[PDB]
Amino acid sequence: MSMVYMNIMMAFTVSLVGLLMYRSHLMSSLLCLEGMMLSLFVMAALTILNSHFTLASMMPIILLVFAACEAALGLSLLVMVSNTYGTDYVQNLNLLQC
Amino acid sequence: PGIVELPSLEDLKVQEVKVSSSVLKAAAHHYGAQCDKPNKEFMLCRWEEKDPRRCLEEGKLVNQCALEFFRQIKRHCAEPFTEYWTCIDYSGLQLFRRCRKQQAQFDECVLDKL
Amino acid sequence: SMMKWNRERRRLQIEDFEARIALMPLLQAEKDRRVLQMLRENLEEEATVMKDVPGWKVGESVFHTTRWVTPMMGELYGLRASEEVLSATYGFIWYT
Amino acid sequence: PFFDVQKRLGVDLDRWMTIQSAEQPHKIPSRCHAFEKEWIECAHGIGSIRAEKECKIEFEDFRECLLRQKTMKRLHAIRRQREKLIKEGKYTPPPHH
Amino acid sequence: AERVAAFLKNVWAKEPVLVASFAIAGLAVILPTLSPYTKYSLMINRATPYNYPVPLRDDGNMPDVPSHPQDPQGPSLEWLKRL
Amino acid sequence: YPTKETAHWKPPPWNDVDPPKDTLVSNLTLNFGPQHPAAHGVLRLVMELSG
Amino acid sequence: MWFEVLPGIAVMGVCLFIPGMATARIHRFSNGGKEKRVAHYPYQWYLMERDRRVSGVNRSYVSKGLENID
Amino acid sequence: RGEYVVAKLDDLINWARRSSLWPMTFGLACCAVEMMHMAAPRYDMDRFGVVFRASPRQSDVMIVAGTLTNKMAPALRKVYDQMPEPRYVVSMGSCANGGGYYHYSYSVVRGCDRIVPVDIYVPGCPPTAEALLYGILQLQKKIKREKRLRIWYRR
Amino acid sequence: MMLYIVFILSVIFVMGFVGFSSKPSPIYGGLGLIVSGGVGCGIVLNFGGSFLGLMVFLIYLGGMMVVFGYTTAMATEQYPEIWLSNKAVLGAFVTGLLMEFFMVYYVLKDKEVEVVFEFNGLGDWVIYDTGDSGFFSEEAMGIAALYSYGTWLVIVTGWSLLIGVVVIMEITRG
Amino acid sequence: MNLMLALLTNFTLATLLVIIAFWLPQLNVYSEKTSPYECGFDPMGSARLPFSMKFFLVAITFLLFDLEIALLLPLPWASQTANLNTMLTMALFLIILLAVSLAYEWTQKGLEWTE
Amino acid sequence: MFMINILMLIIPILLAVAFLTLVERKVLGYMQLRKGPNVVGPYGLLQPIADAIKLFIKEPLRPATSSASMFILAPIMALGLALTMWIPLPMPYPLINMNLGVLFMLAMSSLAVYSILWSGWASNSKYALIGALRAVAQTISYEVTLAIILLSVLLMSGSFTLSTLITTQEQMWLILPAWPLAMMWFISTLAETNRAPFDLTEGESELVSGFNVEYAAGPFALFFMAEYANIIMMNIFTAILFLGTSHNPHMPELYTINFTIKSLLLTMSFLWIRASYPRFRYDQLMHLLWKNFLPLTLALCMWHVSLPILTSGIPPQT
Ligand SMILES: CCCCCCCCCCCCCCCCCC(=O)OC[C@H](COP(=O)([O-])OCC[N+](C)(C)C)OC(=O)CCCCCCCCCCCCCCCCC
Ligand SMILES: CCCCCCCCCCCCO[C@@H]1O[C@H](CO)[C@@H](O[C@H]2O[C@H](CO)[C@@H](O)[C@H](O)[C@H]2O)[C@H](O)[C@H]1O
Ligand SMILES: CCCCCCCCCCCCO[C@@H]1O[C@H](CO)[C@@H](O[C@H]2O[C@H](CO)[C@@H](O)[C@H](O)[C@H]2O)[C@H](O)[C@H]1O
Ligand SMILES: CCCCCCCCCCCCO[C@@H]1O[C@H](CO)[C@@H](O[C@H]2O[C@H](CO)[C@@H](O)[C@H](O)[C@H]2O)[C@H](O)[C@H]1O
Ligand SMILES: CCCCCCCCCCCCO[C@@H]1O[C@H](CO)[C@@H](O[C@H]2O[C@H](CO)[C@@H](O)[C@H](O)[C@H]2O)[C@H](O)[C@H]1O
Ligand code: SF4
């Protein structure tokens, strides 16, 4: 494939590894989810624009709409985690081991 | 998978209509009226064949009719036409609406002399 | 007032669009020759550059079909100075 | 679709955007329109098992149009040979290049 | 009507901004169906030629298709000039 | 099956509700004055703020 | 008095006039005395590219009229 | 001639600095009321380029307008240290000058010059708004006489 | 060099991703995401998507501003971590940069590269379309068709956004 | 190329002014001068301590509403369609649902800041 | 020649910004029964020059607790993006003619907010942080209404190109058919530029100096220039949107003179407003936009989608 696809596919993989390798802040990982959506938007937009798939031009817009619903949902849960524990640390969410 | 058959450079040779877009736009409405037949025959060819190499001869007749069309303007209405496409050329958008006076002079010239 | 003005702007757009429709055959005829001529020149220089290459067959398609296929930018401007390649690829996007 | 209510009800919910050779606004064609049309018509009705072998030529052409992988492989070779010859001094480009 | 009319005069006193909003949104929803000029919007949009008009092969039996653009046959925009 | 790794596990609450942490969402403490346009230059208004 | 605020307004007005005046004049200078060609859509850029080829001097603002048709 | 060039550059930086003195919005007691009257229309300090700014980072002058107590002294020194340089201090009124009516009190600093260096002392209890303005214009003339670049040239 | 503009932007695109994927303080992660949003907008613009490019930049700028507010409230510590302050963060940062540097160095050396999957490296311009002169923006025509072709898309997205408001209210009402 | 040049010049000009600002003046750096500002008294606690957001729900609602404008911005182009019956209905449907969503959050006290 | 065109854009901008500072001080002064600057140069004409020189030979401070890189970056962003906002403005010809010029200006305005957030956060001080979070609240308040207000106006113009607004208003100012939107646009620009009665991110009487409280000297000047540059630019945007000037292609300077007068008067109204009103509370600003403008803006966005269609007056796409 063309060389741009190398860097966009690399960007998605970097964000995916970022998502799968948590640190402490839950917000750091929610950022990696938004990054994953950014790389999909760019990769989808390039393919659609290059091929002149006219009707598909709206598809990246729809992707962003549900990226925001995902982001808003992630922040709402972060608020409730923050209220319960005083931090958004993910190691506090271990009650359900038992 | 096979070699692509390209016409030789000496089959692509036609006399070119070397005028600027402002010149083409000024004459476009009369050009579309006068050169309809060869022009609509080339476009029916291109859409039917879906191949530029299958329509070269038709495309050459488009060029010839265009040169003949501009020769007629040159012989009769050269000066009213130059004023008109000079006015169109000034506009960054090449707007018809800014040059209705020069267009009127050109239109009545070609209406009388042709 | 805006209704009347926007109606006149729609009548002016139609006239502008129709002048383009008048000229499209001439522009289409020219574009065909320029593309075919540019492809011929690429094939002349492919012949010499790849003359010594063992398996090369100059001008060979990558498609099984013999139908005409519109060339991509790399094929049309494959062996041309970057300045004209830059103009043909990014000229329109970068114009103001 | 798992349940084909679209076919039964005769309502087009999403199959208008499934292929690039379907009707587009103002009849703008996709770059690979003809290749997609050729592959789609070859494979129509015969099923994927047959289409995977009996329409391989059409699919390969369509795939080449989509990603142009073989075209860049060819242009890469010509560009590599040219840069080799130039430095060796064997080749001079024509005035129009 | 009294209950609704009394409700109207109440929201004018308390929330005139929301009264205007609902009034404006209502006219947006309703007037396009009552307008006599709505039909021309589609006609104008349809008459704008973004695409080349590819000619038809004269098979010898399409009497309602013009041979020349200045021939009588075909759609006309006289309605648009008088608009 | 008890194991050394699960020795510290306790059955969950009967009604699924764990007690609330006594964690302190501490308030921000701000020196509002003395050198402040609204403190009249000599008021050290020590304020505890939540937002 | 209030009219003593005008000198600063006049200086401010002159400065805000220059960018528009300069851009308009620089455009005419760089396009042979005409407005800079506006290319919002591919069609307009195609015509401008053809003008550059047709000019003979690689300038899309050098127009060729009937004098160039034989 | 370097002497001539540095002399003219001194005039420019001096002129720019005295023409744009931004006092810190900082006042302590009754003297601060007369400072308000200097900003009021009759005297319009702003017409001299003198503009109050609340942040010490954006101030050139500290006008100590009122009594400095022992409890307030560390805060006054703090906000003076936080002024970037060059910075100037105008002592306004008897209290700031040397303690004034409260000189013998257990809780009062006997003059703000025990805490910060002072460029101008404005006498009065309070100095009139005009007296304070006279002090500001006296500060301007002190800045006009500065020889920073001429002394650097001869170092 | 300008012919490789899309490739250069895509390199910065990845660098921004390494920025926030190494997960420093979310203040700096947000900055990394904003840079990638801008260059990502630059990349999509160079393929003819002016509206898509600007829209994704506009959306992520609003998003990261809300993330900034939530960071100062719910994801802060006394010593927020830059990339150099934490060994795990620094190691991820350098690892990502080195992998990117190597893929770039080799793909620009051979005009091609094989990093798992074969990528051509002739410049992204070779694949572009050659023949267009329409009086409209094709991307604009496709996007506008949302309201005439995409009735079904409008309904499901419209409903999802309304339910989203309902849902966040429920989730955050303890 | 013109756009890139214009951006480079703007930020180059701003960067140069900052370089002059830091290398032209005479500095006198010491501890008390650069300490954080809190009206003359030392701060109590770090400024990095959590700062509660009382409009947190409006902020999340902003993300959803901010995306609606991305759906609505193409409306001038959609008005150029021949299929105006569908486009107008769908255009009004989207705005109405946004208005309903605002009304819900309003009536359910979602726009009021936490106390 | 284009590089010269750029310099003939930003140097005048900086000069106009410098003398706007004088004009505001004089205009405010006379509304307050005083004079404002009238000593430093005749009628105070040199006052801006003294202030600029003063600030740039003043010692800049990097606070001990501050994040060094972000602290320096933010003022560069503020001024660099303030200048960027001017390049697509048709006066009557833009320096950069854009297809989506309005969308470019929205995006560049959103990016500029981060020069407030990062300066405030990088300072690492309480008044700076409070100021920054007020900017978060301010952007949430006006951004959605601002975009939808523009949309409604652009449904009469037909495109996102700023030069098309000149064509749209050839016969009549858009303020006539859209004065309700012009009113709500005008208030939004006051909130967008952090101007009174929405000067909350600074909020002097409350936060000393808010987000820029730790900034001194040259770095402080950059924030000041950026703000006053945005005040003029936002009022040029308003003049183009609603008070469109007629453009004679052969006498483009007549457009510039007329358009400059309108831009100046609109800028004066900003100074006028600052002299007249008290300040909003920053929660009350959010409720103003969301509970008043947004309901009205949604309704008027519906009306301006339908009005072209029902009157058969849809603008041309091109
Ligand atoms: C909107 C843009 C506006 C920008 C305006 C820019 C300012 C224009 C006016 C310039 C006037 C000349 C500057 C003089 C101010 C110097 C500060 C000062 O007063 O220090 C006193 C000092 C006095 O030092 P000193 O040796 O006497 O003693 C100080 C040390 N202690 C405290 C121990 C006593 O002057 C100097 O040290 C040098 C004076 C040099 C004068 C020539 C200036 C050259 C500047 C180049 C510096 C090199 C770094 C590059 C910076 C960027 C270059 C542009
Ligand atoms: C011009 C014709 C179109 C007009 C459409 C007007 C619709 C207005 C919708 C309500 C907007 C007002 O917002 C709020 O509404 C509630 C009811 O919901 C009103 O309160 C009302 O509640 C109930 C009815 O529901 C009544 O018993 C009560 O007496 C009345 O005050 C408030 O006065 C007002 O604060
Ligand atoms: C802050 C971190 C920033 C990271 C940015 C990362 C950038 C990635 C590297 C991009 C460099 C690409 O480098 C690009 O390669 C091609 C190779 O043909 C060169 O293109 C070349 O074309 C022909 C080849 O015969 C030569 O005559 C010409 O001299 C040369 O320009 C470009 O001149 C060069 O600019
Ligand atoms: C919570 C869910 C809320 C759902 C709200 C849905 C609101 C829908 C309100 C009706 C809006 C459309 O109303 C309808 O508009 C179309 C134009 O677009 C009009 O259509 C008319 O003009 C068009 C051209 O513009 C012609 O093609 C058509 O033949 C003609 O009938 C209809 O006469 C009118 O009835
Ligand atoms: C399609 C676009 C045009 C339509 C407009 C769409 C937005 C409609 C918003 C409707 C809001 C109705 O519901 C709203 O709920 C609250 C209850 O908390 C009511 O009442 C409350 O709010 C108002 C104002 O904040 C207060 O004066 C009142 O004291 C309080 O009780 C509002 O008066 C009412 O307006
Ligand atoms: S000097 Fe006089 S007026 Fe000033 S603070 Fe002291 S007692 Fe009050």
From TrEMBL, chain J:
Core subunit of the mitochondrial membrane respiratory chain NADH dehydrogenase (Complex I) which catalyzes electron transfer from NADH through the respiratory chain, using ubiquinone as an electron acceptor. Essential for the catalytic activity of complex I. GO terms for biological process: mitochondrial electron transport, NADH to ubiquinone. This is NADH-ubiquinone oxidoreductase chain 3. The gene is ND3. It is found in: Mitochondrion inner membrane; Mitochondrion membrane. It is a multi-pass membrane protein. It comes from the Eukaryota. Its EC number is 7.1.1.2. Its main location: mitochondrion. Core subunit of respiratory chain NADH dehydrogenase (Complex I) which is composed of 45 different subunits. Interacts with TMEM186. Interacts with TMEM242. Keywords: Electron transport, Membrane, Mitochondrion, Mitochondrion inner membrane, NAD, Oxidoreductase, Respiratory chain, Translocase, Transmembrane, Transmembrane helix, Transport, Ubiquinone.
